[PDB]
Nucleic acid binder design. Structure first.
Lengths: 93, 102, 46, 63, 77
RNA sequence: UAAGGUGAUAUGAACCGUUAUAACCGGCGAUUUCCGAAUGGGGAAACCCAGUGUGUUUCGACACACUAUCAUUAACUGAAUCCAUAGGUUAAUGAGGCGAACCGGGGGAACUGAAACAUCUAAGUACCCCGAGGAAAAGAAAUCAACCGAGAUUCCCCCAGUAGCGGCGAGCGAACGGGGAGCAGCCCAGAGCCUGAAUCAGUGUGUGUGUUAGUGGAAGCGUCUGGAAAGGCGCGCGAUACAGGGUGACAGCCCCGUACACAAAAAUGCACAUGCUGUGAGCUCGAUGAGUAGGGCGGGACACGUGGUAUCCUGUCUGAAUAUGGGGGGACCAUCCUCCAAGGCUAAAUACUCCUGACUGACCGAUAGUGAACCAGUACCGUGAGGGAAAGGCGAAAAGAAC
RNA sequence: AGGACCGAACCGACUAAUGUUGAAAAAUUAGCGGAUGACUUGUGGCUGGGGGUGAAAGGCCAAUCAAACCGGGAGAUAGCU
RNA sequence: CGAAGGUGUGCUGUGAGGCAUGCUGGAGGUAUCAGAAGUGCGAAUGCUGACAUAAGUAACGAUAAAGCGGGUGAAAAGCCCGCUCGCCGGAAGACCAAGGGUUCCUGUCCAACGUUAAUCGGGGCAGGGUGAGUCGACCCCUAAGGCGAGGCCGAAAGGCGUAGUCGAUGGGAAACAGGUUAAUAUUCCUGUACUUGGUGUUACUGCGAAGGGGGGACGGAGAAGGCUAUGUUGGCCGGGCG
RNA sequence: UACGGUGCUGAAGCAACAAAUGCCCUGCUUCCAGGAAAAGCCUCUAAGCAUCAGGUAACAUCAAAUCGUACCCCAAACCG
């Protein structure tokens, strides 16, 4: 079965929107922010449904949060998941 | 439960100019009320984005306490106290020693 | 030279971990006393 | 009393939930991280609406 | 556990007194030996760890009454 | 309940609302990731890997529910073995783990004192374990008493540092009896009659009283100094309210409140006209609890250290009478008195405070009072159990210093 | 074949010098001893305090050892300062 | 119209002390007589905080040394670039493991950090960066050992242990060259591959397990022989004519 | 040419010799001190079923999830 549309909320932020992300759109792929527990097939079905595109592969890396904070009140940024969704052909985006 | 409403003609009893009267601009949760023309402060404002972009000394209203201000009676030109006197949901305000609804 | 603390996290979690303390009754008293003291870490593992 | 959701007590709540979640939270999140001004209040509105629809679905499953 | 299983006798602490009346702790232990007891009604041998006093209780009362007391206690044969 | 709100530092953007419907408070629900008794299995806590079923399938898979162990009960099976039993499997019901103290029990020191120390003491204390409850334990006379009597247990005041016990040293230290606080007694070993019979539980919409939201609530002006009156001076008013806290300095009349009166959808606690259900009232007698009372040996407890040592408990070895009976009355014997052992239940007066609300302090005031007034069991140290800080104040208002 | 020889890595620690408020709470520099064995080393595991372990020194058991460390009895006691 | 505190001056009592005032201070203090004390400090190798001293003295951390030009900047011995110099080179090179956890890269800043200055840094502050069917873990298995239903044993806690279940430091399937970013590569791309399952189709057919068997599956020293990584040299090719 | 770093094109690209402590080799020899286990893998049956399940080969198609992946790397990122 196809994962339900409720589980198709795995896509969170449309782009990391950085220079390597734009270079990957020039090449073929689109860089996305996906929740933490999203499987590669979940990103695949999610992108093929929410966007119009056909995906060749998804590559996932979990980004680790930096401390980014002074010593009096130590904090940690939340870790997240980055999905390189490869669209070699049949890409409108 | 508020003697001083959001918009009410009030006259100061203590501090700065007591005789000054004006509409309350806002009522804040701290117990502090900003009333027009009653607390003017010369604020030295550095150039800051969005609001007050040119900068400059500005005349803005600080907030006196709500206890300092009392409502200005329409019938008589004196500060008069205000009581809530109705048994159901509408706590109607009434002038003390005058018994007129506010 | 060689020092007393040569770290190994496997030995650390087996020696002073939560499951290691939760197995023994007395280690549960260690955890209970740490909870009573109010510590953020009752176990070195986290 | 502050608000009554008599609209939610009617039927067909699941397609309304799919509309509120699918493409609504999806476009508001995508638009928000792209950078949209009004969407700050709208994001909270659609999240609370999703909570309301799911509460009514737990109360009654006919819709 | 050194429990008589019929009388419930168990080790009891005490002081091993001396001529100088020095109290050093000692333990008085029960006279338990495992014995095979023949139940004529059940047609089967029941094995119980028992003190000599418990064997005397069994010969005084019958193995069935003691067995009913054991099942009432929850003690297993 | 409300004219303001979107918790704080923390302002701003984007909005929400007019006592008729925003926020906020109360009650009741829903959701409630993962870890943790953790409970499908595993594990290096917050992770890895399954099975079974029901659906759906996009055939790639996706959801949801269940699946720990033990005790009890019931069923269906089922070995050596012949009948069976052990065993297996399933269903249901419970339990588990945590928590500051109090309580009961299982075990149990030493420093110390004795101006050493071994008997003794510290002390059945510290500690470990087990168990239960809102209290627990105890508890209805084989009890004291002394020829008079009292009448279950617990707690307080004396009795009283008394009698005693004691290397008669250090020390330990009752009881009788009196004053109170509280105070109901029962039940089973056993048949018949009566048969919710009096009770006691469970379960109850009706009734009152509380709690968890709240509401109303008096009466002050003129002037002076001052930055600002709350201070002064004058003249008033309130007061069942002059408890307190704020307000630009010290306010009974400025504001929260205060006395005082009122309120509760809903959820609950107590007393219940109390309905219903079940256990079981009272009447005649036959007995009223056997490896038990007792004894010998070794210990423990009684204030009592085995002493002249009663009494209670049992590790070991024995062992009655049985209401013609037996126990106690401090070695023991007779008499007299008093009570029925070897089966249980039971409120009150009592102990304590994790926690909550209100009020008080010849309590502290930032080297104090909690370790912590403060984003503290934090930083920091240590492999670990563990140890463990320093750190409050501008101003009335940021009017926090445009140029 | 060698608990053979000479000798790097490796393991150890014989003399000297410097350091001794050091670069270091036992190091550095010159020389030294073993280095196919009773060797050395990594990764886990086991043994717990009147206990362990010891080719034996009262060595070692987290820079702590004729009895580790942590909390409790505990404000032990102190005819002594 | 100036309370406590702090600081002077005068007066005053045998003293401990007191009274008045100037200055500062910006909300309190308490005649008199009673009552209770955390009721008086200069010492305890006293405890805590502040501040001196030695003293602007030792030191600035391997004796692998740097010089100059140019740039930048308010400032250059230390930053960047360039040219010479020296050092290591069975490492002071490069890669894994453990351990750490953003220290990686880019811009900006020089208050604290860096034993000096710092424009620089692993410092501050933002923004980026970690791409896998083939590599590890996960997983299948087991060793030492751990836990262990039932069980046995122990005063309670608990000890031991069968079935079982864990446990790598070992045994199990598979990808290499070249290119790429400021930072990622057996992961992205390009080229050429390999492995294990599922489903379907076709053909053929006896398949089938905590069972049996085989295999996995193993020591030390030593002696070749063959070969490769790798090096040298020649040829070739491109440039040189010092 | 911001001299970081990019865009295009590109000759020769062979032979001999010397080669490891690496490979063949878990081989060979020799010696006593006689040198893991289980799974993967192959094979044979049992219960069980019978144009079945199942196996074996081909062909096609789909899946190969999740975590780590920067950096230090005998050290200014480990322990001191």
């Amino acid at each position: 079965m196809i994962r339900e549309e409720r589980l198709l909320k795995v896509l969170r932020a449309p782009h990391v929107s950085e220079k390597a992300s734009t270079a990957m759109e020039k090449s073929n792929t689109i860089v996305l922010k996906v929740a933490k527990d999203a499987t590669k097939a979940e990103i695949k079905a999610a992108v093929q449904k929410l966007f119009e595109v056909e995906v060749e592969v998804v590559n996932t890396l979990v980004v680790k949060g930096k401390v980014k904070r002074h010593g009096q009140r130590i904090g940690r940024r939340s870790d997240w998941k980055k999905a390189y969704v490869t669209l070699k052909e049949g890409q409108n985006l | 439960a508020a003697k001083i409403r959001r918009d009410d003609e009030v006259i100061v009893l203590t501090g700065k100019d007591k005789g000054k009267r004006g509409k309350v601009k806002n009522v804040l949760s701290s117990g502090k009320v900003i009333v027009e023309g009653i607390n003017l402060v010369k604020k030295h404002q550095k150039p800051v984005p969005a609001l007050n972009q040119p900068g400059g000394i500005v005349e803005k209203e600080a907030a006196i306490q709500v206890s300092n201000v009392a409502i200005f009676n329409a019938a008589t030109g004196k500060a008069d106290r205000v009581g809530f006197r109705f048994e159901d949901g509408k706590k109607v305000r009434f002038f003390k020693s005058n018994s007129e609804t506010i | 030279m060689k020092r007393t603390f040569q770290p190994s996290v496997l030995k650390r979690n087996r020696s002073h971990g939560f499951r290691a303390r939760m197995a023994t009754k007395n280690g549960r008293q260690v955890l209970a006393r740490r909870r009573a003291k109010g510590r953020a870490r009752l176990t070195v593992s986290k | 009393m502050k608000a009554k959701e008599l609209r939610e007590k009617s039927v067909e709540e699941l397609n309304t939930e799919l509309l509120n979640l699918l493409r609504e939270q999806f476009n508001l999140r995508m638009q928000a991280a792209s950078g949209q001004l009004q969407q700050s209040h709208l994001l909270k509105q659609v999240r609370r609406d999703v909570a309301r629809v799911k509460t009514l679905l737990n109360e009654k499953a006919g819709a | 556990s050194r429990v008589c299983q019929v009388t419930g006798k168990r080790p009891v602490t005490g002081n091993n007194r001396s001529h100088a009346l020095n109290a050093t702790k000692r333990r008085f232990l029960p006279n338990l030996h495992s014995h095979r007891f023949w139940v004529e009604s059940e047609k089967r041998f029941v094995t119980l760890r028992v003190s000599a006093k418990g064997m005397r209780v069994i010969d005084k009362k019958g193995i069935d009454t003691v067995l009913a007391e054991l099942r009432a206690r929850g003690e297993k044969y």
